[PDB]
């Protein structure tokens, strides 16, 4: 199927990509890992994102994510997220066209009593897709927890 | 990987399923798609869930969703899904090992606003996928909306 109008400007997304990333955070000594996603679409005003991640020495599972982006030409954008720890995510925010970036914030975190507030930022830089993500929690302001660059494959 | 102990009582998920689905709601006339299933897992205490759906004729695609299914020995499960409407669900319940059920309500239904609760019910019968999805809205109590039947491929 031809690429929706809506999807369009997101085009550049489209593939697999696999890197690695960092995690971090008050509460948590630093860990690395190993990631890819990939971003489908069947036609439709959305884009399909799987995610997992693996421990970088063995290749072992660690964690994976799902979910749809919905991109609409007035450069909003609204990402539902579904993660196999048993969070899910609303987030919301814009997309611009010019720096190839996508900057999302939580309009809900389900299912997880202590973060509170979720904000995701991607950003294609020299053909690699970085992003970081960062979690509040009712304790700690919103801040980065993982960070990672991976290349389009 | 090993089936983890968690997700053994449900390996009678695990692999695709394909079948056809009947929707209708007050709002709402009848209609009918074709469905397809996966359930997979990693070795971790997941299973996870892919689905998509066709219009019957054509095969043209419809919607699709995505999440994790978590079971737990006390008979206890949470499944998280996101939807390409842009739809989450938080779904807690339970399974029942000897009628091949889970039986899930949701504890939360995120960015749809008219839809209040779902519950989403599965039964293996003579080896086939059966479910009834219910819709609540702040005017429609509980309620059927979809209901398949799939094989096991």
């Known amino acids: 199927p031809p690429v929706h109008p809506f999807v369009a400007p997101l085009s550049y ?6 890197g690695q990333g960092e995690g971090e955070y008050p509460t948590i000594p630093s860990f690395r890992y190993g990631e890819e996603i ?4 069947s036609g439709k005003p ?9 421990k ?40 611009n066209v010019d720096e190839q970036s996508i900057k999302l914030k939580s309009d809900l975190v389900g299912n997880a009593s202590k973060v509170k507030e979720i904000s995701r930022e991607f950003e294609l830089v020299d053909g690699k897709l970085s992003y970081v993500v960062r ?7 919103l801040q980065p927890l993982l960070k990672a660059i ?3 494959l």
Chains 1, 2 share one sequence.
């Open 13 to 18: 997304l489209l593939g697999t990509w696999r």
């Open 38 to 41: 990939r971003f489908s679409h």
């Open 46 to 54: 959305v884009i399909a994102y799987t995610q997992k991640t693996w």
């Open 56 to 95: 970088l020495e063995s290749g072992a599972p660690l964690l994976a994510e799902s979910g749809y982006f919905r991109p609409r030409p007035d450069g909003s954008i609204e990402v539902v997220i579904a993660c196999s720890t048993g969070l899910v995510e609303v987030q919301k925010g814009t997309y």
């Open 135 to 141: 979690w509040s929690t009712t304790t700690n302001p």
């Open 150 to 152: 991976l290349d389009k």
